[PDB]
């Protein structure tokens, strides 16, 4: 029969060429294994999740669910402390997926000696969920199936919003900032920029970014650390999203500086329970979205009710 053409990947570290569809697939960093799994491929090895589950388990629920539905088993790399090059070698992969990753040039070179690497396009950790699918699925020789995975995922998002008309209308057009605010040390906090997939995902849910975000937008990173003394700059946000717990909101409202911020003052804050599957899903994968989007929308919806 007719064999597939060769695959040319243009990424941040140059170019990667595959001559056939890889049968043995390794993935690293975050989420890339879910792209392979959503395409019906069980990886010969992938990185332990360093967020959302105990280190003992190391695998997120939607990821584990798909694996068992494929009658496969989870082969985890012991790489919570950093890339485990030997473990990757032992898996004998034909390709290494890293479309969403923070690997360095040094990392890429070592990995490429093991197997062809699908790296990110621009800067570390600056890959949006659609682009993550595009990169990873192309490297698997499943570019066409990848475009259909994107289509079906976009459809799942849209249908879920349609299931909750009140929430959809409530959050539509609301100005949002995804942040990391620690109620313990409120002297400074993080704001994730539009280059970050967990911020971009919010625009898929119907929300928009305030114009103040542009000031913090840059080529540097996916997140910007700003002082609490500059908190007035984000008064144009209707709703603020941050990781935290059941004591976070009240602590922020009682903060002398942060408590003056409109969204915080109004209670228009979506607190995502830190180190839970829900929290981990905020940087979306095709598997995570289907698993958590309804719970996510309920938090966002409740926060946007307090928005003026
Ligand atoms: O390796 C990660 C772990 C979980 C993660 O970083 N998160 O942001 C999820 C919520 C984090 C929880 C508690 N962690 C830490 O608070 C520290 C600061 C932190 O993670 N931030 O996002 C703050 C801006 C970052 C510091 C730059 N650090 C890096 O560039 C690493 C990737 C980084 O910190 N990025 O956020 C890119 C993310 C790949 C998403 C998940 N992979
Ligand atoms: Cl509703
Ligand atoms: Fe982070």
């Amino acid at each position: 029969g007719h064999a597939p053409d060769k695959i040319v990947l243009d990424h941040a570290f140059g170019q990667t060429i595959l001559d056939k569809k890889p049968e043995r697939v390794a993935t690293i960093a975050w989420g890339n294994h879910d792209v392979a799994l959503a395409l019906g491929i069980v990886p010969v090895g992938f990185s332990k999740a360093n967020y959302g589950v105990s280190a003992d388990k190391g695998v997120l629920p939607w990821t584990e669910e798909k694996i068992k539905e494929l009658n496969g088993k989870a082969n985890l790399f012991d790489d919570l402390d950093g890339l485990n090059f030997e473990a990757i070698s032992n898996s004998k992969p034909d390709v290494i997926l890293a479309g969403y990753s923070g690997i360095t040039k040094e990392d890429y070179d070592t990995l490429s000696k093991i197997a062809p690497v699908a790296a990110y396009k621009s800067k570390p950790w600056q890959t949006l969920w659609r682009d993550m699918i595009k990169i990873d699925s192309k490297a698997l020789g499943m570019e066409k199936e990848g475009d259909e995975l994107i289509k079906n995922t976009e459809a799942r998002i849209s249908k879920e919003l349609e299931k909750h008309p009140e929430i959809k209308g409530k959050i539509k057009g609301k100005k949002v900032l995804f942040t990391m605010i620690n109620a313990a040390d409120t002297s400074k906090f993080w704001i994730y920029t539009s280059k970050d997939p967990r911020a971009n995902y919010l625009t898929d849910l119907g929300l928009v970014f305030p114009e103040s975000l542009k000031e913090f937008e840059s080529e540097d990173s996916f997140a910007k650390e700003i002082s609490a003394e500059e908190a007035n700059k984000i008064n144009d946000a209707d709703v603020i999203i941050t990781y935290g717990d059941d004591k976070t909101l009240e602590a922020l409202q009682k903060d002398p500086l942060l408590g003056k911020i409109n969204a915080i003052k109004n209670g228009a804050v979506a607190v995502i329970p830190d180190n839970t599957p829900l929290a981990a899903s905020c940087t979306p994968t095709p598997l995570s979205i289907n698993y958590t989007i309804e719970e996510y929308l309920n938090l966002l919806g409740n926060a946007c009710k307090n928005a003026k």
Side-chain angles (χ1 to χ4, degrees):
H2 178 82
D5 288 22
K6 70 172 185 175
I7 304 162
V8 181
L9 303 165
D10 288 278
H11 50 68
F13 303 107
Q15 185 184 99
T16 294
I17 299 178
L18 289 83
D19 272 322
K20 64 165 298 185
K21 161 198 269 285
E23 61 179 59
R24 299 186 59 84
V25 180
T27 74
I28 57 181
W30 189 272
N32 303 289
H33 49 262
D34 286 343
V35 179
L37 282 170
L39 293 174
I41 299 177
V42 182
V44 299
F46 61 99
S47 295
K48 274 191 182 181
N50 61 345
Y51 189 79
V53 279
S54 70
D56 173 70
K57 192 166 188 179
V59 50
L60 293 165
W62 50 85
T63 300
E64 193 180 22
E65 187 180 71
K66 189 57 188 294
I67 289 178
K68 281 170 191 175
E69 283 164 10
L70 294 175
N71 294 120
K73 59 185 301 176
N75 314 94
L76 301 174
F77 293 143
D78 294 332
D79 62 345
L80 289 174
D81 301 318
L83 287 173
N84 194 337
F85 292 130
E86 180 183 284
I88 300 182
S89 283
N90 295 335
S91 71
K92 301 283 166 48
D94 299 322
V95 74
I96 300 178
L97 302 184
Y100 186 38
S101 62
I103 61 173
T104 65
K105 172 60 169 54
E106 186 178 80
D107 293 329
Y108 175 80
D109 290 331
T110 302
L111 291 169
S112 295
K113 294 179 182 179
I114 305 178
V117 181
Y120 50 80
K121 297 283 186 57
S122 298
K123 299 298 182 179
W125 303 116
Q126 290 190 30
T127 298
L128 310 183
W129 73 264
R130 286 180 183 83
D131 191 37
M132 180 186 61
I133 296 178
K134 266 195 154 297
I135 295 174
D136 293 343
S137 70
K138 186 178 182 180
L140 295 178
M142 306 192 64
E143 182 175 6
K144 150 215 195 254
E145 292 88 344
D147 290 328
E148 198 170 4
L149 179 52
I150 297 176
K151 171 170 124 297
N152 295 324
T153 305
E154 291 173 340
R156 174 71 168 93
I157 301 182
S158 184
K159 292 175 71 173
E160 192 60 35
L161 291 172
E162 172 54 46
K163 283 174 52 185
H164 304 281
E166 145 157 69
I167 299 182
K168 172 182 171 63
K170 207 77 178 191
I171 71 181
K172 189 71 174 181
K174 290 292 189 295
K175 304 165 196 170
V176 64
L177 289 175
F178 203 115
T179 67
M180 176 179 296
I181 311 175
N182 180 23
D185 180 23
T186 56
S187 59
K188 59 185 188 304
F189 60 97
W190 289 96
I191 298 178
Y192 295 92
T193 70
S194 65
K195 305 296 181 57
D196 191 281
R198 95 198 72 194
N200 174 261
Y201 182 41
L202 303 173
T203 68
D204 293 319
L205 301 175
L207 298 95
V208 302
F209 298 138
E211 335 182 344
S212 71
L213 186 54
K214 301 180 177 298
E215 178 179 335
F216 311 133
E217 286 289 339
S218 188
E219 183 182 58
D220 323 319
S221 56
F222 50 90
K224 184 79 168 60
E225 190 174 47
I226 75 167
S227 175
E229 297 208 47
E230 332 172 32
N232 56 280
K233 290 181 177 177
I234 66 170
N235 272 337
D236 58 338
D238 289 282
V239 52
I240 290 175
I241 308 177
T242 183
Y243 308 101
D245 49 32
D246 57 333
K247 294 180 179 183
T248 296
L249 178 54
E250 160 177 313
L252 297 181
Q253 288 180 328
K254 294 184 175 181
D255 186 273
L257 292 185
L258 267 47
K260 302 298 176 293
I261 302 174
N262 284 340
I264 290 178
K265 184 178 57 183
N266 291 334
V269 173
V271 179
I272 319 298
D274 187 77
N275 203 25
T276 65
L278 178 58
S281 73
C282 286
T283 59
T285 77
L287 293 180
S288 80
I289 289 182
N290 176 80
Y291 201 93
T292 64
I293 188 178
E294 186 171 65
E295 188 176 2
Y296 202 22
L297 284 178
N298 191 253
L299 284 192
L300 303 188
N302 289 336
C304 289
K305 294 179 179 182
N306 294 310
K308 291 177 167 57

